[PDB]
Amino acid sequence: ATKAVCVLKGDGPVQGIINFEQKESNGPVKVWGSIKGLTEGLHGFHVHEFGDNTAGCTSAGPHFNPLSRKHGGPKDEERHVGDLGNVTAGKDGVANVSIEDRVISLSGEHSIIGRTMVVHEKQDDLGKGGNEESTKTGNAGSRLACGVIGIAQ
């Protein structure tokens, strides 16, 4: 029953804590937590390749894409492993995250342990924006806050 945690920090007001849980080996991963400081609405929410914060969110690299696919939403079969879609902030500025995903894992080749959770500036278009950036980043924009995903108890 693996568990992970991620503390999200950026250059601005956006901060939060994301929990990860996988009760079965290679079974679904439950992703839940809270992010505050956001503008109201949808924000891209992706696992990026590298858990490298040496240069802020920038050195986390691209959406985690071990199987070399195009960008999609969580419910797409065309997607990066790291494609978790959007999270929704209320007028509050808080996004209560609750996601369940079978593509990310906390063990093996698709493990996101040691990688980076990034919350983005803009709504993720889920690869339907009809341009090359869409199939890359979802047009999700800049990286507002991130942290390395670590093993939790």
68: contact with a copy of itself by CB under 8 A: no
Q: How far is the CB of 114 from a copy of itself (least distance, A)?
A: 4
Q: Is 84 exposed, middle or buried (0-12, 13-18, 19+ CB in 10 A)?
A: buried
Q: Which of residues 84-143 bind a copy of itself (CB under 8 A)?
A: 113-116
Tell me, yes or no, if 46 is annotated catalytic: yes
Least distance to a copy of itself, CB of residue 10, Å: 14
48 among known catalytic residues:
yes
User: Does residue 120 have an active-site annotation?
Assistant: yes
- The option from Zn ion, a copy of itself, none interacting with 150 (CB < 5 to 8 A, set by class) reads a copy of itself
110 is catalytic: no
Partner whose binding site includes residue 83, from a copy of itself, Zn ion, none (CB under 5 to 8 Å by kind): Zn ion
* Bridge partners, residue 116, by sequence: 48, 148
**Which among 83, 101, 124, 125 is annotated as catalytic?**
83
Q: Which of 43, 71, 79, 115 is catalytic?
A: 71
> For every residue of the chain, which 3-state class applies, written as one string?
CEEEEEEEECCCCCEEEEEEEECCCCCCEEEEEEEECCCCEEEEEEEECCCCCEEEEHHHCCECCCCCCCCCCCCCCCCCCCEEEEEEECCCCCEEEEEEECCCECCCCCECCCCEEEEECCCCCCCCCCCCCHHHHCCCCCEEEEEEEEECC
Bind-site residues for Cu cation: 46, 48, 63, 120
The residues binding a copy of itself (CB under 8 A) are 4-5, 7, 17, 49-54, 61, 113-116, 147-153
Active site residues: 46, 48, 63, 71, 80, 83, 120, 143
Bind-site residues: 46, 48, 63, 71, 80, 83, 120
